[PDB]
């Protein structure tokens, strides 16, 4: 057996969100029910509902209001709809199989996960800026450099240094909503005597907006 | 409704100990229970169901025990594998109810930060924003304070913080401080300095630049 969620990744505030599970491997009309949980961010989870093979649906009653849990038999897919959303609704849906009855035991067991996020941001590109060290702050034999990923929604971003050959002392910070857009900053580390000697860059990807951007660290001077 | 309560909230581990999470319900459940674990940046998956039957696949140094409102899921000989999340379900009762998590990161020796200071980009400031970086870098224990000071006296707003999970190959932490000024306020100051407090040192490293 094999659950997929899928569905839009932003929903805005005060509508409605919606998410499909497809199962394959098994049948929904058959046995178990069909169950939708999340994961709010600070990881917390929390059980939203089920539909069970014979289309009888329970509800946490904390979701009573704004859920409704429906299925097509056709496709072997069930669905989520959550209405009248805000923020704390943000969160990481996941669908999943459990046993109805008591007897026969049946382990519970969940799909993938997907984020939804809610929000009334535009899609906006990155601005892109870097890091280097106050001329001269103290040298040692390594020195470490950064870029500042401002202003950018949705996410994800993803930054690389010198494409991929700098792979070791590298860290990318995750990112922080600042004023309805996201922020972050990766941090990349090298001998001092390769700096600026050897030429360090770092790519930022935001595929969202079809955006690639270089910024070549340079010493400040 | 059920209320479940785990612990510990977090525990740092060695690879060959023993470790024991502990679930609380608020009633008997009747090992309607079921443990679930959650590999970092990963999904959910049971390992557990019925407080003690242990899904296949699911390795043998796993196993769960317990009755009535007390169980409890041990590792016999941690692996790297194991560090994650781990979450206990009730499911005798609707709402079904989760654990807040208990969260298995790996021990080490102690590490001081390196931090460096950022300032503002020419490009930024064409724009008319100021953003000052700090890092605080691949420290141990997780436990790390920071302070901003502008000529002498502390800043609080205006200040977003960023912390990475547990390094999986070096099991260090790292944090990113940044204070976002506008131009015109970060102008009219000279001295900009970033603190990082840790259990390494008795007085904090600090890092400085001045405008000129």
């Known amino acids: 057996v094999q659950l997929q969620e899928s569905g839009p990744g932003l929903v805005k505030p005060s509508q409605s969100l919606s998410l499909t599970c497809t199962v394959t491997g098994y049948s929904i009309t058959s046995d178990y029910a069909w169950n939708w949980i999340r994961q709010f961010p600070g990881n917390k989870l929390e059980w939203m509902g089920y539909?069970?093979?014979?289309?009888?649906?329970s509800y946490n009653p904390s979701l009573k209001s704004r859920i409704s849990i429906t299925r097509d038999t056709s496709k072997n897919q069930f669905f989520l709809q959550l209405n009248s959303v805000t923020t704390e609704d943000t969160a990481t849906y996941y669908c999943?199989?459990?046993?109805?009855?008591?007897?026969?035991?049946?382990?519970?067991?969940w799909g993938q996960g997907t984020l939804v996020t809610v929000s009334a941001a535009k899609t906006t590109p990155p601005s892109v800026y870097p890091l280097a060290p106050g001329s001269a702050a103290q040298t040692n034999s390594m020195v470490t450099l950064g870029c500042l990923v401002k202003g950018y929604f949705p996410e994800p971003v993803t930054v690389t240094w010198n494409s991929g050959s700098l792979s070791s002392g590298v860290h990318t910070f995750p990112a922080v909503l600042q004023s309805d857009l996201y922020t972050l900053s990766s941090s990349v580390t090298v001998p001092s005597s390769t700096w600026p000697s050897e030429t360090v860059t770092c790519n930022v990807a935001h595929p969202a907006s079809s955006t690639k951007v270089d910024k070549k660290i340079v010493p400040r001077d | 409704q059920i209320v479940m309560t785990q612990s510990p909230f977090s525990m740092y581990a060695t690879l060959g100990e023993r470790v024991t999470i502990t679930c609380k319900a608020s009633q008997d459940i009747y090992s309607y229970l079921s443990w679930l674990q959650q590999k970092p940046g990963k999904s959910l998956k049971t390992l557990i169901y019925?407080?003690?039957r242990l899904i296949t696949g699911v390795p043998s140094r796993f196993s769960g025990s317990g009755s009535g409102q007390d169980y409890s899921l041990t590792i016999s000989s941690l692996e790297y594998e194991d560090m994650g999340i781990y979450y206990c379900l009730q499911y005798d009762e609707f709402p079904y109810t989760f654990g807040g998590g208990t969260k298995l990161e790996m021990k080490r020796a102690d590490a001081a930060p390196t931090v460096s200071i950022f300032p503002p980009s020419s490009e930024q400031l064409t724009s008319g924003g100021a953003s000052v970086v700090c890092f605080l870098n691949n420290f141990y224990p997780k436990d790390i304070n920071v302070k901003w000071k502008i000529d002498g006296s502390e800043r609080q707003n205006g200040v977003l913080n960023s912390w990475t999970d547990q390094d999986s190959k070096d099991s260090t932490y790292s944090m990113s401080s940044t204070l976002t000024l506008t131009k015109d306020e970060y102008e009219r100051h000279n001295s900009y300095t970033c603190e990082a407090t840790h259990k390494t040192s008795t007085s904090p490293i600090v890092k400085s630049f001045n405008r000129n």
């Open positions: 999943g199989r459990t046993g109805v009855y008591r007897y026969p035991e049946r382990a519970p067991y």
């Open positions: 539909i069970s093979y014979s289309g009888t649906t």
């Open positions: 019925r407080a003690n």
